Design a protein around this ligand. Sequence first.
Ligand SMILES: *[C@@H]1O[C@H](CO)[C@@H](O[C@@H]2O[C@H](CO)[C@@H](O[C@@H]3O[C@H](CO[C@H]4O[C@H](CO[C@H]5O[C@H](CO)[C@@H](O)[C@H](O)[C@@H]5O[C@H]5O[C@H](CO)[C@@H](O)[C@H](O)[C@@H]5O)[C@@H](O)[C@H](O[C@H]5O[C@H](CO)[C@@H](O)[C@H](O)[C@@H]5O[C@H]5O[C@H](CO)[C@@H](O)[C@H](O)[C@@H]5O)[C@@H]4O)[C@@H](O)[C@H](O[C@H]4O[C@H](CO)[C@@H](O)[C@H](O)[C@@H]4O)[C@@H]3O)[C@H](O)[C@H]2NC(C)=O)[C@H](O)[C@H]1NC(C)=O
Lengths: 119, 47
Amino acid sequence: QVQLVQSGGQMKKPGESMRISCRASGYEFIDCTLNWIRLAPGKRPEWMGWLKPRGGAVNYCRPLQGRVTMTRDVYSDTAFLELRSLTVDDTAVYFCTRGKNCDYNWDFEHWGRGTPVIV
Amino acid sequence: AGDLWVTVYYGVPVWEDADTTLFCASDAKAYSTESHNVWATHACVPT
Ligand SMILES: *[C@@H]1O[C@H](CO)[C@@H](O[C@@H]2O[C@H](CO)[C@@H](O[C@@H]3O[C@H](CO[C@H]4O[C@H](CO[C@H]5O[C@H](CO)[C@@H](O)[C@H](O)[C@@H]5O[C@H]5O[C@H](CO)[C@@H](O)[C@H](O)[C@@H]5O)[C@@H](O)[C@H](O[C@H]5O[C@H](CO)[C@@H](O)[C@H](O)[C@@H]5O[C@H]5O[C@H](CO)[C@@H](O)[C@H](O)[C@@H]5O)[C@@H]4O)[C@@H](O)[C@H](O[C@H]4O[C@H](CO)[C@@H](O)[C@H](O)[C@@H]4O)[C@@H]3O)[C@H](O)[C@H]2NC(C)=O)[C@H](O)[C@H]1NC(C)=O
């Protein structure tokens, strides 16, 4: 089976930045697309953008266009996400997520263990 | 002007001892393509 081990959830303050990693295993890191879906209190699970680790191709969600920055070290098979200009509202638990197969990104069978950031 | 003749049969159930090249067939149960085996390679035909 595949698994996505993640970073520890840091404690932050508004008007700052955060960076949370996500290491993948059990599959070819390049062949499949990875997402970042955070979950805040009560709101629908918010998808922020997918990352295709071939050539770092990305597609960010409209409200996050400007703050979000999804990268990856294809060598350490690690997925990175930076989020500047922090808010108490964008506070959430973060989950790196790849689909069922590489033919379809949106069936998220594989989730990573939640990383809890506090703002 | 005879009685018996040579008659030829194809598919006759006979064998002789022999040495030949033998190829490999694997059980194909190795799911992980990443972690591939040194003996049960991809060239092994499926069982
Ligand atoms: C293809 O071609 C494309 C187009 O050419 C390329 O696209 C470009 O890509 C680059 C990225 O590679 C992108 O760059 C941006 O860079 C920003 C960094 O700049 C900031 O800092 C500088 C430096 O200021 C400090 O240093 C100087 C001296 O060096 C000093 O004079 C300053 O006072 C200041 O010093 C301070 O500190 C010292 C410490 O000692 C003190 O002593 C001192 O007293 C000071 O306190 C600033 O100059 C910048 O300011 C600009 O941007 C701000 C943003 O609000 C403006 O307010 C500011 O007026 C100025 O904007 C100018 O340009 C605009 C547009 O023309 C004018 O309207 C305006 O009037 C000014 O003339 C920066 O503060 C970086 O921060 C930035 O990212 C941020 O901004 C974007 C929006 O722009 C946000 O969305 C982000 O979220 C970030 O907040 C960005 O990365 C270029 O902008 C981009 N080009 C365009 C047109 O967009 C492309 O790369 C190329 N190649 C490919 C492959 O595509």
